Amino acid sequence: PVRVLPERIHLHELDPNPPGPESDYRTRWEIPIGLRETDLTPAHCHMHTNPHLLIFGAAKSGKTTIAHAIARAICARNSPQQVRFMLADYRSGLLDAVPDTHLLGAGAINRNSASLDEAVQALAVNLKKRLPPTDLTTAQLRSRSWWSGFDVVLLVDDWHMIVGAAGGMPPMAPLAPLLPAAADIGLHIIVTCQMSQAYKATMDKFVGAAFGSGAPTMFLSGEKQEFPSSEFKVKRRPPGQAFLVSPDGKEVIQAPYIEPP
C-alpha cells in the first residue's frame, strides 16, 4: 500500500507542452486524461479513432472538474476551425469550461430539456449531411475528405439529471441514428454520470451506445454495488482517482485537476 499517484495533478502539470493546431489530426486528438499509476505516464484518449469518453463518479468525485480539464486539453490542440463544443450543463457548472471562440456558433449552451432538445435536433441535421457516401473505400473513409470543417465535442455533465428531467422525447434521440458513424462525422461525446445511475445508463441509447461499442470509461469513486463487475474495480476513492477501462486495458489513473471559474 505505497501511494504512487498524487492526490492532485493540475492539467498544466499533466499536459505541460501540448501540440497545437498546426499538428496533424491524430496528434491533435491524442487527448491526455490522467496520470497512470503503473508508470507515472499520461494516459490518452485516442479520439482520432475511438471518439468518446465516459466519466462515472459518486457525488463530488471530480466529474465536472475533469470534464472541464479535458475540454481545455482539446482546445489547446485544436483551433475553432478544428473543434466546436456543444454543452449540456443543467447545473451551469461548465459555462467557462471552453473559451467562447470554441463554442458552436449556435445552440452551444443548453441548461434545460427544452433548449437541449432544440439544439441536439439542429446538430443532428448538420451531422447527418456528413454521413459518408456508401461507395467510399476504407482508405477514403479514414481520410474524412468528403466533408470539411470542425469536429464537434458534445460535452455533457450530469447525464442522470438530463435523463431524469427528460420531458417528452428521450434526450439525444436525434443523434442515436448517427452514433454508429460518429468517428466518420467528427462527433465526440464526453459524458459524466453519477455512479448510482451509471450502470443503468450503460444500457441506454446514448451513454450505453458509446459504452457498448468500447468507449473508454473512467470509474471514479463509487460503491461496489452501484456498478457490479468482476473485471472492473469500483470502490471508494479520493477525488480524481479512477479505474480507467478501455479496449487497450484496465489501469488506475489520477485525472487532471483545474481551478473552477
Binding site: 456558433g105 449556435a106 439542429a122 446538430l123 448538420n126 449531411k129 470543417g149
Partner: peptide
C-alpha cells in the same frame, strides 16, 4: 415556417 424550422441548424457554422 420552413425557413423557421432550419433557423437554428443553418446558423451553427458548418
Amino acid at each position: 415556417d420552413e425557413e423557421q424550422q432550419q433557423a437554428l441548424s443553418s446558423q451553427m457554422g458548418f
